[PDB]
């Protein structure tokens, strides 16, 4: 649908780190976000272009537990369209969510994941994570960083899956407030 397509065009970029291929969401200005396990370095390949990462901060919850979200500042020639207003104030569930994926290997894809329900605790590959949500869809490898959306709202970042189920880190507006 319209919102999704626009989001892909204006905000979602194919990326590559030493950990592999990832989908990346640009939020505003030169601020972007990745799944923590992508482990961005001093630099990253964005659309086949070697870009400098200026800042990299990993998000943890009130008790210091991993949220699986890394916020990076980019050395870039342009600014991302500002979508903070499409991100809810509170981590929000959803009904018929589209998972937007875009890596060099899985380009410009819209995956129908169904209902997104509140999960919470998640053992992601041996690393404890909080503030996760879940969808019943056979999610596969290479989809991490994928953007979960529904009716104009950007609500989560795909971080992993167990074969029958997919999991995303929830998105709150507060994660992205100015600098």
């Amino acid at each position: 649908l319209d919102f999704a397509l626009s989001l892909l065009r204006r905000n979602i970029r194919q990326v590559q780190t030493d950990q592999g291929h990832f989908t990346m969401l640009g939020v505003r200005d030169r601020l972007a976000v990745l799944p923590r396990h992508s482990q961005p370095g001093k630099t990253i390949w964005i659309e086949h272009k070697l870009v400098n990462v200026l800042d990299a901060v990993e998000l943890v919850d009130e008790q210091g537990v991993n949220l699986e979200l890394t916020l990076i500042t980019l050395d870039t020639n342009e600014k991302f369209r500002d979508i903070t207003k499409f991100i809810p104030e509170n981590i929000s569930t959803a009904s018929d969510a589209t998972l937007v994926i875009n890596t060099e290997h899985m380009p410009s894809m819209f995956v129908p994941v169904g209902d997104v329900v509140q999960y919470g605790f998640l053992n992601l590959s041996g690393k404890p994570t909080h503030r996760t949500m879940m969808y019943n869809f056979p999610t596969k490898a290479g989809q991490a960083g994928g953007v979960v959306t529904s009716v104009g709202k950007v609500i989560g970042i795909h971080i992993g899956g167990n074969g029958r189920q997919g999991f995303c880190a929830g998105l709150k507006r507060s994660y992205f407030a100015s600098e």
């Binding site: 990299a56 901060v57 990993e58 919850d61 979200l69 916020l71 994660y175």
Partner: peptide, 7 residues
Amino acid sequence: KPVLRTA
């Protein structure tokens, strides 16, 4: 080591 932030 990573720079952290409580959110």
